Symmetry: D2
Subunit: 304 residues, 4 copies
């Protein structure tokens, strides 16, 4: 009578939750054990492969992860997982040995989410603080708050009360099996770096990446993806010299749009829309497995 749920563990600050046995038959597997500040491409490749391979062995997946880069992993899996069963990511803001630790109830709600049949076909989900959040818009909004995880542009899909979810939204951007990114045979990802804009910004980070032959650069622009003059110069050069350039923003909400202050087509640049720099990096890496044409990368940025 209960669903089969596989917990895949990666570490982070998050048996000790026996009330799980009320809602699913849980099996645990250690994939890695790291703080997610050391999250990397290899871990991501491992996770997508495991999920895709093991899909027909379970009814859903919960991935325990650190909270620091949970938002990057959730979007990577959102674009590469082809399993059409729920994949829910979860962490904790307080250690398990601390007073009023969030990990037990968080895990419980993540299992609830992975077990719910209404959760399929919603893409990869993050479940934190009683809320089901899509892997594309979810981000860490505060450095220490238990309520930190929000979908700051388009909102949560669902709230969880008493083990039940009232879903009122689903992401429209294409995800999972509706994307072309197939990661099954890949052992590395294209090299993509992020540079930060501010007053009197150095061009040296952007130059270091270009000198290294990086495949992509994401700018964390000011305002609507704007670039400090030295940084602009160096990127405009990179984009005609073999490096794809995506303009995002350091600004924590809203789109980096087309048709603002930057002639994207003149420079061969791509506007990130609502993807923040770390998220744009995810979709840039995957675009680069398929194309290096900035027109075609911009299309990818317009659909996923």
């Amino acid at each position: 009578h209960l669903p089969n749920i596989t917990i895949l563990a990666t570490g982070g600050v998050i048996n000790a939750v026996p009330q799980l046995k009320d809602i699913a038959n849980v099996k645990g597997e250690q994939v890695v054990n790291i703080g997610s500040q050391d999250m990397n491409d290899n871990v991501w490749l491992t996770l997508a492969k495991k999920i895709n391979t093991d899909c027909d062995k379970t009814d859903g997946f919960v991935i325990t992860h650190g909270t620091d880069t949970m938002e990057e992993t959730a979007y990577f899996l959102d674009l590469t997982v082809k399993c059409d069963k729920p994949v829910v990511m979860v962490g904790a803001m307080r250690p398990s040995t601390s007073m009023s630790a969030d990990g037990p109830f968080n895990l419980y709600n993540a299992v609830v989410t992975a077990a719910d049949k209404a959760s399929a076909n919603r893409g990869v989900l993050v479940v934190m603080n009683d809320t089901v959040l899509d892997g594309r818009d979810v981000t860490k909004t505060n450095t220490t708050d238990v309520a930190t995880f929000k979908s700051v542009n388009y909102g949560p899909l669902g709230y969880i009360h008493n083990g039940k979810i009232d879903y009122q939204r689903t992401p429209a951007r294409k995800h999972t099996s509706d994307t072309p990114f197939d990661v099954s045979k890949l052992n590395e990802l294209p090299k993509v770096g992020i540079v930060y804009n501010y007053a009197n910004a150095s061009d040296l980070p952007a130059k270091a990446l270009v000198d290294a032959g990086y495949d992509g650069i994401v700018s964390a622009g000011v305002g609507n993806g704007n670039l400090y003059k030295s940084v602009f110069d160096t990127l405009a050069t990179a984009a005609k010299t073999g490096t794809a350039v995506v303009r995002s923003s350091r600004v924590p909400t809203g789109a980096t749009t087309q048709d603002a202050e930057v002639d994207d087509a003149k420079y061969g640049f791509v506007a990130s829309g609502t993807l923040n720099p770390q998220k744009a990096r995810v979709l840039l890496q995957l675009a680069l497995t398929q194309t290096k044409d900035p027109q075609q990368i911009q299309q990818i940025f317009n659909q996923y």
Copy 2:
């Protein structure tokens, strides 16, 4: 008797689609002030830089006695940075109010006119004094330390995301209910009157699989400081951590901030600052932490004194 208010124009979308045309665009300003304008520069704030900052702060400090208040018209993109620099360096204790516009003056429902008006109202209010340098946008008075641009296009983008606004503006009047506690203006030791340049401080971003090359480049270039835009509570990808540990043992100041948009990068978390000679930025986001680090480095290179400065200002 109306107050005398000086507008110092620097450019931005508010001056776009100089200063003398701005005033004539808002004649209602004559109802609340005698306004006089000076163009200091005319740049997009994406191109703001240490020299415009020194020029403004020197100018305000020099011209303090000649006016009753200052309004700075400025691009939105880096207004939060300029605001905090001026907050630490102006010694004038007449109000200094920054203002921009998120829509072009020629566009429908342009926010520039009513924003300017409100910035003047604020600079004319005797209660605006002794609150530090201010940002006035969308009917709201915001302190220069906490104010940040939250959204890429919304007219309401500017928010003090941790501690809230100082006061709200309705029908040309302000109900002030808050003032920043952190020391500002004439309570800081920072004196830029005889400074021709600022120490070099760069910013590096942290994410999964972060490259150390951007950090290495800034070390190779002999940077006086580096501000880390960390993950979560000021955390660093290992490669980045390692370059920044090595740098701090050879006299580069290293301040851990966070790419996360609200909350403090705290002391006593996952990083042993005292061990590496790193500084925790508190609620200062990376571009704000740069502002303070640059000024910290005019006084001191000691990591412990620099930490004390990040606890007071």
Copy 3:
């Protein structure tokens, strides 16, 4: 080549926008002229009838309205409009004669929204401050701010930049032609009143309504729809005496849930979910045109 758009005007603080001619052939009609603080049942009946009757005469509707009760009208139309062409509501926070008045660009964006073919089948929409918001979750969050209108539980559907909308969400709750509420032959609505909970609350408002024979009472509860003891007593009486009782909350976000501190089935009560008191009142009035069974009213509250 341009869409036919009918502006229906009701008043509020919001020709003078000639740039409309770039995006549609606009026709205006005065239905009423009031401040929306005097919005009433008759105006709503008029509006739904007009839209339904005139549906095949236009490509979309923009309704100009005051901002005070725009959120109540948008949900009423959201449940009663059977036209499957966009119906967009719009107002202004600043008078048209004031500096940097929001009405021109707001109207422009509302027309953009009503003209967009992607806007059909999304229910009744409110467009304010560059944002397309669903009529069920949208509410006035601040007394004076131009950015006041937000969908505070589930987020916007879409942002508008340079005359274009990137839609990433649509409401899941049933709306428009997927609801049973047919208003075409009705000339009045069931009488529904709202009472407020706080410390030491008087039962006198609730009693006045009951004494008046009201069909429904919405409680603006404390917390998770809780009721001051005197008010609870009076409502528990009303619910067994011919008055339907819906528990909402004065709290501006989140659900009044089932299975919390109030035994709803014991008392014959209905939990409002995410509907605030004014919105619950809308759906209560319409439920009462079809049923007075609290089990069946609770179902309606669970689907619309």
Copy 4:
């Protein structure tokens, strides 16, 4: 030397699923204070009332010299109301900190334990003094006037939605950056030491097609005041307006507030307060405007003096 901190328990979900079991539930409290507990009542705060308010305020004022700080355990539902009443009536200038819990103590990841701890930390901090009565929830210190419950179930529900929090709590320490400007505690004229009851003030809601019957009922009952939960900027449906106009001309105090969850109900908007003898509530939401109106009516019935009180406190 640890400080002496008194917990006054009133009930709520934190005391649920008295006071002596609460302490034993949080033994770590012994690391930061000598705690002593008194049960004052044991009710859900949905049932909070004028008598519990008088009892708490009298008690705190009486017992001020016998302890170093007070923590009040309380239901979440009306904590914002109690907090503001105590903010206007306690004359003790040791910290007074309110705390509840949104999950039951028996539930997974119960917030009650760590909340209590933080409330004690706050009440023990000498810097918490002279800031008025405080609410401590979700690692955040909030002033009693602005604090409100924003969400029906979230552990982070409590926010000062207009002017922000006072300070944040990390590893048992507080960085205070704000204090309320509005007069509180020993700067208010409100003295409830010899009061056996409070004036009668009710709340009426405004929406489309609003009934006047709830307003009429409160007038018929001879209410001393009525607080309107208005639409938008304190506006009233016509029937409601008319009953409340008639009432104010026969000595009922009428305060326009707003059902809208942030922002002020302003003077000089669509309602001519001076004409009807109405008062504008400012940022006080309806349940908060009641708190102040009740206390205003212990001093005065004049609409103009009551307006002045709504501008100062």
